[PDB]
Amino acid sequence: EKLEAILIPDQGYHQVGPADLCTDMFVLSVTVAFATKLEQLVPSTMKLSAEGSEFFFYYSLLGNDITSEPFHNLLSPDFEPERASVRIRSSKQILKAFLSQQPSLQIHLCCGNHSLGSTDVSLSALAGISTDLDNKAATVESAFILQPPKRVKQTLPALPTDLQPTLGVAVTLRREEVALQ
């Protein structure tokens, strides 16, 4: 059968693997830390000037819809670093295998009901380095490039270098009793 993260509603954790064999608590977390060059994802300077310009990040973490704190300053981002975490009851081996099999997390920069761009954050990459979970948290931290949903990207003026929209993300897996530090 397919390894699936099964919400236990009353308890507020997700069971991964058979509940009698997979009984340890883990925390899986996503942190959006900073961003730059986001203005490339908005075609019109005038949209930045409107106050309806309220931007936030969205992603689905094991089937949970997560939105971040809205911010207005797209050209000079001022959102605070923000973490969302889920609790998982599983075993080391089963959870590591489960994460290695998950599709990438897709984090979207949104305005209202529109996605302006998204980036792929590998959970399998995190599983691959989750090799000492009895003793330490495992973290993948990187600057991820946001891609607009359009077919053609136009750049004016075209320069030799290409500073692109970037989102700093950290994804972490740890045993619940192992402090992040």
Numbering used by the authors: 166 to 346
Tell me what the authors wrote about this structure, in their words.
CEP120, for example, plays a key role in the duplication, elongation, and maturation of centrioles, which in principle could impact the production of a functional basal body (Comartin et al., 2013, Lin et al., 2013, Mahjoub et al., 2010, Wu et al., 2014). All three C2 domains of CEP120 (C2A, C2B, and C2C) adopt the PLC δ1-like topology II and are structurally similar to each other (root-mean-square deviation [RMSD], 2.4–2.6 Å), with major differences found mainly in their loop length.
To obtain this crystal form, we introduced an additional mutation (G307S) that we found serendipitously. Residue G307 is solvent exposed and is not strictly conserved. CEP120 C2B G307S did not reveal significant structural differences when compared to the corresponding wild-type (WT) structure (RMSD, 0.19 Å with 181 aligned residue pairs).
